[PDB]
Every structure is written in structure tokens, then in C-alpha cells.
Amino acid sequence: PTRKQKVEAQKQAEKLMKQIGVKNVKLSEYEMSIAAHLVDPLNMHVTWSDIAGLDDVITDLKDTVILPIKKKHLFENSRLLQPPKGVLLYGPPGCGKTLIAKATAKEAGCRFINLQPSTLTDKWYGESQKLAAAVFSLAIKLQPSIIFIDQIDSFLRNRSSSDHEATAMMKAQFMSLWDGLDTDHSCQVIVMGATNRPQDLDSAIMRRMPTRFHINQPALKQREAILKLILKNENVDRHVDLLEVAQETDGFSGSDLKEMCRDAALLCVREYVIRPVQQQDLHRAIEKMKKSKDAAF
Amino acid sequence: PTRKQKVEAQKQAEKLMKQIGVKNVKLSEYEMSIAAHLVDPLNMHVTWSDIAGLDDVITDLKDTVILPIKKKHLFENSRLLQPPKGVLLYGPPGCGKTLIAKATAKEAGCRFINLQPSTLTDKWYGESQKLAAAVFSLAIKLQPSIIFIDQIDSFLRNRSSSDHEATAMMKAQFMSLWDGLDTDHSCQVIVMGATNRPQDLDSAIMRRMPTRFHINQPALKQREAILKLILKNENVDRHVDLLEVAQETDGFSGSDLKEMCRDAALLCVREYVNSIRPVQQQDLHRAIEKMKKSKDAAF
Amino acid sequence: KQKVEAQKQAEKLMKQIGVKNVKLSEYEMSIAAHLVDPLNMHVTWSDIAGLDDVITDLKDTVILPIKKKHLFENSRLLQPPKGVLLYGPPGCGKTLIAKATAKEAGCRFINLQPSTLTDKWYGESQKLAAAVFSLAIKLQPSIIFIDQIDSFLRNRSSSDHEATAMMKAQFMSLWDGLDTDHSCQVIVMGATNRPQDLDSAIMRRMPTRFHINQPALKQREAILKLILKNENVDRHVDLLEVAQETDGFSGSDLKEMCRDAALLCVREYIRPVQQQDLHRAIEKMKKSKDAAF
Amino acid sequence: KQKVEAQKQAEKLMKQIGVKNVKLSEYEMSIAAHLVDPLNMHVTWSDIAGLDDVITDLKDTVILPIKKKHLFENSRLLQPPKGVLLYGPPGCGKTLIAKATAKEAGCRFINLQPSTLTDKWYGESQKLAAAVFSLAIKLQPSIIFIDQIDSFLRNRSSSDHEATAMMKAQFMSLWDGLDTDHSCQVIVMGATNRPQDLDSAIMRRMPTRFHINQPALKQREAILKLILKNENVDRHVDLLEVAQETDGFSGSDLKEMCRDAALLCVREYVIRPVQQQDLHRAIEKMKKSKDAAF
Amino acid sequence: LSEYEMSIAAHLVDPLNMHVTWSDIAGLDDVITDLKDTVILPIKGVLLYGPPGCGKTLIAKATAKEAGCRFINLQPSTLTDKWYGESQKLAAAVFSLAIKLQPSIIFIDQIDSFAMMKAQFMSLWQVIVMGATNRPQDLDSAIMRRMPTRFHINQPALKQREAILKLILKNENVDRHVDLLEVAQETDGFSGSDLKEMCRDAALLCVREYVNIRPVQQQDLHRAIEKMKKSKDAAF
Amino acid sequence: LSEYEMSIAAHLVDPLNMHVTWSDIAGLDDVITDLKDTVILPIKKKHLFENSRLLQPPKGVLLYGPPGCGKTLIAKATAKEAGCRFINLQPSTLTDKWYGESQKLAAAVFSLAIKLQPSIIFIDQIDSFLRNRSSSDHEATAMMKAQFMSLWDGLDTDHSCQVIVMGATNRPQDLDSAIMRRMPTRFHINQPALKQREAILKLILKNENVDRHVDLLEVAQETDGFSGSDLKEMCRDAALLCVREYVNSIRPVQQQDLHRAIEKMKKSKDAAF
Ligand SMILES: Nc1ncnc2c1ncn2[C@@H]1O[C@H](COP(=O)(O)OP(=O)(O)OP(=O)(O)O)[C@@H](O)[C@H]1O
Ligand SMILES: Nc1ncnc2c1ncn2[C@@H]1O[C@H](COP(=O)(O)OP(=O)(O)OP(=O)(O)O)[C@@H](O)[C@H]1O
Ligand SMILES: Nc1ncnc2c1ncn2[C@@H]1O[C@H](COP(=O)(O)OP(=O)(O)OP(=O)(O)O)[C@@H](O)[C@H]1O
Ligand SMILES: Nc1ncnc2c1ncn2[C@@H]1O[C@H](COP(=O)(O)OP(=O)(O)OP(=O)(O)O)[C@@H](O)[C@H]1O
Ligand SMILES: Nc1ncnc2c1ncn2[C@@H]1O[C@H](COP(=O)(O)OP(=O)(O)OP(=O)(O)O)[C@@H](O)[C@H]1O
Ligand SMILES: Nc1ncnc2c1ncn2[C@@H]1O[C@H](COP(=O)(O)OP(=O)(O)O)[C@@H](O)[C@H]1O
Ligand SMILES: [Mg+2]
Ligand SMILES: [Mg+2]
Ligand SMILES: [Mg+2]
Ligand SMILES: [Mg+2]
Ligand SMILES: [Mg+2]
What we know:
AAA protein, 6 chains of a larger assembly, 13 helices, protein transport, binds adenosine-5'-diphosphate, binds adenosine-5'-triphosphate
């Protein structure tokens, strides 16, 4: 009688299941365990507005994912007006991919679940395959839901003969149960995949996500917008030309700008020990971050 | 008394096997555990008509692998004219591999069973080999049946030193029970599988499936045909130059063309949902550009 | 209950194979169920073609110690081997030879089916492994067969279950150790696709090794002529011609090629093969043989 | 399984560190064995010289949010920086700065010891790495120190063991993934000797970046002053004079040369201070030995 | 011997069953002549490692009963049972039996392969235990100590190969002037069990020839050499 | 010492099993003298220097130079005449296929280092074991190297455990950057010169018979670029002629066979060129 950590995690999984609010569906062992990673929508504090700079991609994702979910009774007659199985957001590191994912987990219904591949792989034999199958069994049992695989470039890597038989069979069972013999028809089971290097993801799984949204490094206008958002609620001195700094931070990403502004606010509060930012601390922060960014060279 | 979850699998498999329709065959513990995976033909909504673009392959599969199951009155005389003990489909990912088997499950009127390799593996000691045995036992028990294994290569990979003793033992038991000592009398049992990396399948299991079908990457004409297939029920209007749009999408596979058409239809319905309109080759040709930009991402 | 089915099956088969009543208490009885009936499988030496010298050598070296044993009783060294191994490329007669031997060799044949040896319960595996050799000498002469011996008896390593590694020493000690190899005539023959990782110890217990090469031109011609025997093949067909073009082809591959030709002929629904449908099939396989490449 | 003795050992350690009661199932317990008690450390801010701007910025950025936290709960933008790392040439302070932060910042600083994560059994390493963040948020405010993070989290390449890729991917995901990045206050810090091939995403994961450099002329005089405070240095020994001769040397090799020159006074006794001459001879010999390699 | 000591004595092989003697160990007489002064002399562990075959279990079978007093072989399978892990009891009862018949040598074939009962056996550890294994690589750390003497039964060399070969043809008819030294020179990597099969194939070459009663004129020896050479080249 | 510490202690060399002493170390006597004051002396008078903070023994000593000339010898000598139980690491006996093993085996080494103080460690062919850090290599190798470095510098200062790692390399040109820093007290055991030939022939000829009138300066002059091991290897060719002269029937070498040997070894030395 080994592998009895399922009851301890199962207590919390049932607690969270009751918290979210579901019908009397009863998971047995493995999907019951995977239910532990279910994320409550209220916990997420990020809405659609918090994602700034890029709105075309946001509108596309909305109209192509959430719209099929809502008023689904108007699209079943059409054979191919259902949400695609697999949406993957790609691009350079950062730039709000995980932010978009967190936003979707709240303002989309479609009870959200994070996979966290670590939980799948297990020590005992023939125990990780059970979890891999339970993932989709759950996705279709408490339907409708969305699955998230953070950093999907490593877990579902490009298949090779060198990988362990267990992990290879795991990523093959994923493919089989995704759109295989018995699932394709209609289950509104859509996986959402974050990726910083989509080239090494796969060739088959690359197609299993027909919808790929590019998340590029913020440009001039995008940078200005994302910085305007960050300083929306914070206090700054008057007549601060926000656009002017966009040129100074030519190649900065979203998080780089966030840190640039945060370090300036911290410099202000340190000078206190409650002072409006005079935009000179911002320039000093840009100059200081330019050196740290040029770490490799 | 451990591993008593066989009660739920027993109930499920018994109900499914009674639904599919069979005689009072006796299956006790493990054949029952595997019987839970039987796929009922009525559930499948795809047929030979839904599969298009490839006709020669479809005709060859309809004549060589299924007609022997139908024309049993003609092959009891000839020993060399029995059906092949295994046929596999290989090629690039997509374009009907997992769909041809879905159509077969319905059309061939067999006792199609989806193996789902995951069910074979078990944490307890020795259960994997016994389930591997029960698989073929049931197969011969309710012949004529077809066993399907999606991603055969990932499951039945090349034999190496770095594999668990149970997995290798079960993989060798498959080889021994499929065509080894006691088999191939008639048994009408054919094991087919689908894969996209056939080169790493095995040194000899490839021979265990002598007949193999290659699903070519969609070329121009079959691409146009499969696209016209999808564009028959929708509200697509006339004067759509199907040939040109099909020629534009060169490297596209079948699922990629399906996604392109779906995205074009959704773009078209955006206009209505904002406030029911034909796709007059413009939104289609423009969504082709979006799908092209989306494809050129691994570089 | 497992033991009830064991009772039925092993009592039916043991009595059907014509062995005088012996006491197979619990586990020897359980393994007796795997006994193969000499009548069921029907593959004679004539079915084996191409490799005539190898099959003759096997026939002699294995049967003559068993049959005509009276001539060999006075000798202490000329007795049936305590181990045989038939390796080589896949297919091409290995399990075919194994099947044929089980019929025209006497020496009641018992397949091992390694799967049955494993058991989740404690102690069942080792007890079954011992009961195998117990039964083998209980009803001698007997042949033991382990298909894909390389996988079952894989190279000993650290990454193996304690019971699967205990049965290794069990087998090794009971095969030719302290209480065997006197007057038992228990020959253990095995077949394997890959001889690389068989063993270092078990490899020694199977000294006699008959290697069945990939059928060459003449052996390919012979094996191909063999298959086209019952069906209505059209005369004037040059088997040597197709043999020339089937260089890389294997035995089972040629079997499937003939099957495809015959099924193509039947598609024209009662025609004899006139070497043109054979050409179609061989062209198809030459185009497709490089499935990996 | 060896986690029974590991739990027994980590018991005395965790409870010894003045903790709030928490239950650790199996893995967070295994990682708790790496806690470093503040009293065990014997390094403070005063033990560091030559770089006062860098350590002042370090405190201003990391300790100012931690300490006097009652002034930042009203603002969502002023939180401690996640992933503060200190790069630069080998030696000269990095690990010593980490120890100083560990001792003089409280917040139950913990070392990672990346070797403990690797395990032969399948699924062990991936599930163990999550226990790190689990314990960290369990007993926050905490610090996770990836010593020599250059090797642990390298630039992701196509060819790598299935274990390491999943390991670093789960690291990045648990860092700032779906359910994280709030007032938990967890702050990782790494001390790499080479920032060339650390990562592309992990680099962004670390916004704050400190530059520990080879001590300059003034910094070298400062560290030389600090070195011989406990020792009885001679009178009229110009530390600035020897700082010039020791141009390229870093801090550690300078401490070495100092110990070597000091041992000579003992050699002459086996007990007088160093009158600026033994220092010169020792630094000459050490320069020759350093340039002897090439 | 109430319950378990009887279960163990059930494996008590008899001296009359043994069929080996010192002459049967041909060529490897130096190791067994060094033995007596080492082991047989004290009475009137001991582990024998080496390559697969070539006298290990042969040397174990010889001196087992003809020398010593009523020794017993364990064959660890005897320990593991179906019920709730009673092995420990047996593991103890075994040594109990050992004190009954002072002395009785204990044999453990393939000791390398041979949970809690394992530690109990290690702990309980009069006679010197004899453990024969094909690989001393990873036998154990604690077990290796209890066995201080380790006789390396090496792969027979040229002279040793010829010595072991001449024994196989002692009571079997062969041709005169057969160069045993030459055939031994031919076989380089052969073991004793392999020379056995080679000479047996050579003799069968004559038996069959008669079947279709004759000495071996070294032609069948050469044929068996050429055949077993390819036979050995299986893994490679 | 549960599992790994025992695996490493299995390499513990016994002091009495080393037949080398300082009297058997010639040609460079300044090096062994510096060894006394820089390394042995801290270990000596330990009751004296506990008060001194920065005068404790060193951690990491490196002896580089072209092959031979005593790189290998002094090590065992340092273990014999100074106590301080010594262990050779056998760098090749570290790596294994099993995942996560090498890391634990290595950590066990530095554990053995401290729980058996005062313990020296010797890393032969450190270049081979700890080759220059490279961006492109087996992740396991770089991980092991970084773990070794961290545990070396990790929690050793202020502990006064007296662990003095020592590494020898034929070429220090591309050893490392940080690892080289880890071994500060580099000892330049260097190719000796004409003066050393006498020293090397002394220890070898003292036991056997060699007639007088054999000018040591002559054997030093006939060869100028020979190493420490090369001079011993050359004396072999000469001694063998004299030894053989009797077998074809116990004689001293009258400075002549040395000439033939030096000539033959000059010819052989001219092999690559
Ligand atoms: N458009 C935006 N508006 C506001 N903040 C942003 C935006 N884009 C990025 N950020 C900042 O970046 C951080 C999120 O980083 P992000 O989720 O993009 O990392 P990531 O690269 O997606 O992670 P991973 O590598 O695991 O995919 C947040 O703290 C947020 O403040
Ligand atoms: N000829 C076709 N007609 C209609 N749809 C098609 C065709 N070929 C592919 N598709 C589309 O592709 C999808 C099925 O993908 P497919 O079965 O080809 O993947 P696969 O490569 O078989 O997967 P696996 O790698 O598991 O074998 C379906 O949704 C279907 O709409
Ligand atoms: N010499 C032959 N004569 C007739 N048929 C042959 C011959 N060799 C192979 N075959 C064909 O090959 C099939 C048998 O394959 P075979 O028994 O050689 O597989 P195997 O390689 O022994 O199996 P495994 O790989 O498990 O050892 C039969 O259907 C038979 O028609
Ligand atoms: N500013 C300083 N003040 C006092 N000691 C110093 C200073 N800089 C360097 N040292 C000396 O250097 C040694 C510490 O080395 P350091 O921590 O710089 O190694 P490191 O190269 O940072 O390690 P890693 O390679 O893992 O980053 C101490 O013994 C200390 O005496
Ligand atoms: N010196 C010898 N004289 C005669 N026969 C020998 C000799 N050495 C080996 N043999 C032959 O080898 C066979 C015995 O093999 P052996 O007892 O060496 O196996 P083993 O290696 O002990 O088994 P395990 O590997 O299980 O320990 C006998 O049949 C015998 O004929
Ligand atoms: N400069 C020297 N330092 C130490 N030993 C020397 C020196 N010159 C000659 N020797 C003698 O040479 C012997 C060691 O030979 P060595 O040069 O180490 O050969 P190898 O390099 O092949 O090991 C020692 O016994 C030592 O007495
Ligand atoms: Mg992210
Ligand atoms: Mg598919
Ligand atoms: Mg076979
Ligand atoms: Mg440091
Ligand atoms: Mg033996």
C-alpha cells in the first residue's frame, strides 16, 4: 500500500473543488489528484485592462477563445465555429505572456487549471501515465476548462530517441489524448501554452495548437502605453513627458521598464529617509539599468 | 488484497461490451480490464466520405485489409491469401493518420479496440506483462478484431539497455505473442498503429507490420480536394477559386488548411457578432497570410 | 479463483498430451498449463527452406541425443545439450524452427512465456522459476523455450527489481548447478533478435549457437519457390529473376510480397500470377523498404 | 528513502532558528536541512571594504523594503526585488556579500546547494525543486541563494537531459508563473562569476544587478587596511604605496599575499611586524607566480 | 528441529549424491591445493570469484561433502515465502541448524544477487560461508568483509587449457597422436565449459558419421573449433 | 560515513605504504624549504597561531611545470613526514552514468575532507578533471565543476579545519580562472638545470655500485635539456650495458657507458623532430 500521498493532496483538492463551485461530478483517484492544481478565478487579481500596449492580440485572443465559450448555443450548428484545441502564446521573454494567461484565468469562465508538469512525473512505475490520462479525463469531466502548461518548450520538447521511455510515452499519450481517436468531436478542452522558444517545441504538437499568438517586445508606442499603465496609480511630478523616455528605453521589455520605474520610486523613498518623481530619477534609473542589461557584453 | 480497483473497470467494460453486442464470452480479470477500452462503432462520426484527398491509399486499405474480413468464404481455401497480421500508417504529422483509423473503426464492422498504452503500465509488480498478455488473449477471444495503438514508436521504441525491466519484458512479450510460437493459424487478428516518426520505431517490429501506408504531405491537387471537402456545408459563396487558394498554401498540412478555413469563418462572423455572411475569398486569402506568419515561428 | 482454472486447463492438457500420471502438487502444475500440444502446431522440416545445412545440424545435434539415446547411454559426455540458442537477424526461420522442432522431436515441448513467471505476490516468482526446472525433469525429455531470451534474461545491472534479480540467480543455480546435469536430458533452447545484450553468464549456458543469416540469393530463391506451392502460380515464372531484385528482402518480407501479389490477383474477381503482379509488389516494397530512410 | 534521518537532522535546525510552527510533508523538510543559522556566520557589513556604493545600494534596495515594511503596504509598486544577483570577475566579495546579507538581514537566509536537488530516482528532482519555493513562502521573508548559478541555470540548449530542462523550466515557472509575484516577499539571489551564458529569461527574472569589480587603487588600499587591523603592522608602512604595486590582483589573492608576507616574520622567529620590505618581496614573488602560468 | 530447522534441512544434500572429485578439476589444481592449507586444514567466509564458469561451482561441488561434514546449500529461494514475511525466522533458524551439526558449511550461489531479512542475515553472521558469484563488482560492502579469503578462479591459460582439455578425453575413445597442446593453443578465450562443448561436438561429428564408433582424428576437433569460434562471435 | 563517505575513504592511502622522504627529494631544495614555512609550519606550532587570524594554513596549493621533475613525488612525501592523513582522489573514479550520483560522490569527498581533519586532498591531472570552464559541454561536467568549486570555497574560512587541497598539472596555461584562484600558493616546481643531474643520479647510484673518478659534472654536461625522469631513464641504458656484460659470461660503470646512454637518449629525444 504505497503512494498514499494522494489522500493528503486530495483533501485540499476537494476543498478547492467545493470552493470554485461545481456539480456533483465525483473524481476517483488520479483526476481527483490533478484537481489539486485547480486555480480559483477570484484569486487572480489581473483583468484585461492590466494588459496594455498590445490590444490587437488581446482582442484576437478574446474573440477566438472566450467568444466561442459564451453564447456557444449560437455556433454548434456550424461544424467549425468552436474554439480551437490549443492556443500558444510565443515571443521573446516576458512582455506579459504569463500576465495574459493570468488575466484569462479570471475573465473567461472556463474553470482554469495549471498543469505544473512537475506533478505529472512520478517515481513509482506506471504512475505518471495515469496522471497524464487523468488530466484530460478531468478536463472533459468537469468541462468546460482550460489547461495551462507553463514553459511548454521543455516538457513537450522535440522528441528524440535519447529521452527516457517514461517521458516519451508521456508526451506521446498527451498527443494521443489531445485530438486522437475518441476526443476530437467536441469537448471544449483547450490547452494554453506559454513559450519563450517555440522553435524546439515540436512538429506535431506545434500543429496541435493551430492558434499561435505572437507576443513581441514592446515597441515605442507599446512601451509608452505599458509605462503609462504602471504609473497610472503612482504619484509623479507634473509635466512629465512619458513618451520622452520611450526613446531612452529602446530595447527594454515590460519587466525592464517596471524595474526601471520601481528603482526610481525606491530612490525617492530612500531620499525621504513621500516625494513626487521629478523624472530625473527615471533618467538615472535608465542609465543604471543600461549597464546591468549589458551584462553579457 | 490490493489492486481491487478492477471492480470499476470491470463494470465499465462489461457495460460497454454488452452495448457493442457480443455473445457470452468469459473474461475474468485482465481481459476485462482491457475491455473497458473497446470503441463502439456508432460513436465514430467519420466515414470513408469524410476522408478525402487520398484515394489510392484508401482503396488499397479497403481492398487488402478489410475485404478479407468480409470475403471469408473465398480465403479459407488459400492459406497465402489471409489478411496481413498488422498494417501501419506513417508520414508527417497530420493528414489523416489518426483519422483513417477513426473511419475504419466505423466502416470495417470489426471489434475495434483502442489499446491506449497507458492502461498497460501498472505500478504493481508483474501486472504490466499480464495485461499485455490479456490484450492478445481478448483479441483472439473475440476475433475478428483490430487493435489500434496511437504513437506506436513512442510505446514500442527500439530495445535498449536503459529501459525498465517490466517495460522491456512486456515489449518482448508483445513480439512473442503477436507472431511467435502459437499464433497465425487464422485468428483474424491484425494490429495497426499510427505514427509520425517511423524511423525510430524498431529494428524488427516494423517487420511485424509488413504492409505500411505512407500518407504523403498534402500536395497541390489533393490539397484543393480536401479543402473543397471542408467547404461544402458552410455558407461559402460561389466564384471561390478553390484551385488558387489551395495552391497558395504549399507547405500547409490538412489540419493547417482546416484551421485556416475556421479562422476565415470566424473573421467573417466577427462582423455579425460586433453588431451570417459568405466568405468571398478575400477574408480567406487574408487569413492565409496570418496563418503563414504564424507558421514561420520556429525560425 | 486462479487455481480452479489452472486445474481445468492443466488437467485437460496434461492428459491430452499423453503423460503418465505424476504428482504436480501446486506450482509445477501451474506452469504445466503452458505445455504445447505436439498435434496443434503443424510445421514440418519441409516448411523450412533455404537454410538446409543449419536445420540438418540442429536436427542431428538435438534429436539424436534424445532419440536413439540407448546408443549414447554408455557415453558420459555425448548427451543432449543443456542449452541452445538460435540468433541472427529478425524473422527468417528462428521462431519457425522453434515451432517445427516442437513437433518432429518428441521431447515434450513446454513454452515458458516469461510473463507468467512474474507475480505481484511475494515469493511467487522464485517458486515458479524453480517449479519450471522441477517439472522439466519431472517429465523428461523436455524442451524449454524462451522467445526473446535477451529481453527476459537481460544483462544483469543495478536497475532491476529485487525479485527479478533474485530469479536470475535462481535460474542460474538451478540450470546447471549443484542438483542438475546428471541424467536429465533437459535442453533449454532460446531465440533472440539481438544477441548483443543477452548476458555474460547465461550466454555461456547456451554454447551451441545456430545463426540464420538474412536469406541470400540462392536461399531467397528457394524460400520463394517454397511459398508459391499451394496457390496457382503461372508457369514460366522465373523465381531466380525476382530473387535477384529481392536482395535486401527478408523471409517474412517475401511472404508479404507474395501475399500482396495474390491479393492483387484476387482483386480482379481467379487469376494466376504471371510475374507482373509480383513485379508490382516488389517495386512497391523497393520504393517503401526504406521506411526509416 | 533517506528522508527520515534528514528530517530528524533538520528538526533541531529549523526549530533552533526561532520559527513559526509549520508542517513540512517530506520535501520541504529535506530542503530545510540547508538552513544556515545567523549565529554560525561571522561576516558583517564592516568586514567588507573597498566598495561602499555597491553595498549601500544593496541595502537600500533589498533591506529597505524588508525592514520598515509598514510604509509600503499602501503601494503595490514598492516591494523587495525578486532575484537580485551580483556578477563580476572571480572572487572579490560575491560570496562574502551573500554571507553579509545572510547575517545582517535576518529573514532566515537559506543556501540552495544545487547538488542536493539531483536524484537518480525519476520525478525526484522536479518535485524537490518545488519544495524550495514551498518552504520559502511557508516561512517568508526568506532568501534562496543559488551559489554558482552559472552551471545550475545555463542557457537552454536543444541537447540536455530530460531532468535538467524540466528542472530549470519549473524553476522559471514557479518564480514568476501563474500563482506567484505577490507580497510573499520571497527573494532569490545568485552570485555568478560569469554573466555571459546564464540565461535569457532567467536574466530578465533578475531585474536588479550588482557589479562586484576587481578592487581599484582606492579599493585595494581600503581592503589592505581592513586586512591587517587585527595583526600588528609596523609603523610608517604606507598601504597606499603597496596598493600601486599590486595592480591587477583581486581581493582574495591580495589576502593571500598578505598572509604569505606575514608568515615570514614567523619564519625569522621559528616576531616583529612587517616594515614594508617583506610585503614588497612577497608581492614580487606572488606576481611572478601568477604570471608564471602564462 | 521443530519447524524451520526442518524446512532448511530439507535442502540437506547427501554425500552419495556428489559425483565430483579432485581429478575432475584438471589444470586448476594449484588453487585447490592451496585451499587445504587455508580452509580444509583448520577444520581437519570463502568466496570464489572469477569469470563465468571454469570450475567455480565445480570447485564448490567438490570438497562439499567428501570434505567437511554434512554441509547445506541455501539457494535463497528457500527464504522467501508466500505468507507475511516469515523469511526472517528461517534466516535465523538456518544458523540455528548450523550449530546442530558442528560443523556444516553454508553455500550461497550467486551471492551478488542475494529487505529487512537481508539486514537480519547480515547481523546474525561457526562455519565459513561459501559464496560463488560470476562478478565481484558489486557484491556488497558489509558482506565482503565476512569473507576474507577470495580465490580467483582465473580463465584457464594455455597450459591450464590443455590440462583441462586432456581430462575431458580421459574415458572417451580418441585417435592417437592428437596434439592436445595444439588444440589448446588454437582456443584462446575459451573457458572450460566451452572446451567441453567443443570436444563434444567433435565427438558427435564421429557419432553422426557412424549413424549414417570412431576416434577423433583432429579433423572434427578443427571443425568444432571453427564452429564455436563463430558461435562465440554472437554479441559482436 | 554511511554510503558515499565510505566510497571515498576507499581511496585512503596508508602513510607507511609510501616509501618517499625529503632526503629522497633533490635538485630543488628551496621548494621543500618553502614547503616547511608556508604549509607545514602553519600545521606546526598549532598551539601558537590560533590567536593569529590570517596566519592559518592555506586552502589550495598548486605545483605546475613541464612533466616530471618531482611534480608527483613531493605529494606523498608531504603526507609521510608531516602526519596529516592523506588521500588520493583518482579523478577518473568520480564520473558515472547514474544521474545525480557524481554530485553526491563529489560532495562526499569534501565531507571526508573536514570530518577527518587535518586531511589533505590530491587532484592528479586537475586539468583533465577540472578543465577550463566552457560554455559548450556536458551539463553534468560543468555542474560537477561548479559544485566542487562552491564546496571548496563554501564554509571553510573561519573554520580552521586546516583542509589544504593540492593539485598537480603538466600545463597550467588553460586550467581555469576561479579554480586557479582557489589554489593561491602556487609552487613553481620547474625543470632543473645542469646542476640537478648530479642530484638525480645521486639518490639512484648511492645504493648500487659505481666506481669513483666518474665526474658528476660530466654526466651533467653531456645533457642540458633533460628532465628529472629523463635522466633516470637515460641512466638505465648505461647501467644495462654494464649489467649485461656480465650475463654473457657485477661491474662498475667507468663513466663510459653513461656516454653511450646519453648519446642514445639524445637520438631518441630527437623523435618528434
Ligand atoms: N503589458 C504589460 N503591462 C504591465 N506589466 C507588464 C506588461 N508586460 C509585462 N509586464 C510585467 O512583467 C511581469 C510578467 O512577466 P511575464 O509573465 O511576461 O514573464 P514571462 O517571460 O511570460 O515568463 P515565462 O518565461 O515563464 O513565460 C509582470 O510583473 C508585469 O508587471
Ligand atoms: N483529408 C482530410 N479531410 C478532412 N479533415 C482532415 C483531413 N486530414 C486532416 N484533417 C483534419 O486534421 C485533424 C486530424 O489530425 P490527424 O488525425 O491528421 O493527426 P495525426 O497526424 O493523425 O495524429 P497522430 O500523430 O496521433 O497520428 C482533424 O481535425 C481533421 O479536421
Ligand atoms: N525459411 C522460411 N520458409 C518459409 N517461411 C518463412 C521462412 N522464414 C520466414 N518465413 C515467414 O516468416 C514468418 C515467421 O517469422 P519468424 O518465425 O522467423 O519470426 P521470428 O524472427 O522468429 O520472431 P522473433 O523476432 O520474435 O524471434 C512466417 O509467417 C513465415 O511465412
Ligand atoms: N572586500 C573584501 N573584504 C574582505 N575580504 C575579501 C574582500 N574581497 C575578497 N575577500 C577575500 O576573498 C575570499 C572570498 O572569496 P569570494 O567570496 O570572492 O569567492 P567568489 O569568487 O565570489 O566565489 P564564487 O566563484 O563562488 O563566486 C575571502 O577569504 C576574503 O578574505
Ligand atoms: N577444470 C575443469 N575440469 C572439468 N570440467 C570443467 C572444468 N571447468 C569447467 N568445467 C565444465 O564446466 C561446467 C561447470 O560450470 P561451472 O561450475 O564453472 O559454472 P559456474 O560458473 O560455477 O556457474 P555460476 O556462474 O552460476 O556460478 C561443467 O559441466 C564442467 O564440465
Ligand atoms: N630536484 C629534485 N627534487 C626532488 N627529487 C629529485 C630531484 N632531482 C632528482 N630527484 C630524485 O629523483 C627521484 C624521483 O624521480 P622522478 O623525477 O619523480 O621520476 P618520475 O618523474 O618518472 O616519477 C627521487 O627519488 C629524487 O631523489
Ligand atoms: Mg511566464
Ligand atoms: Mg492523431
Ligand atoms: Mg520469435
Ligand atoms: Mg566567493
Ligand atoms: Mg555456478
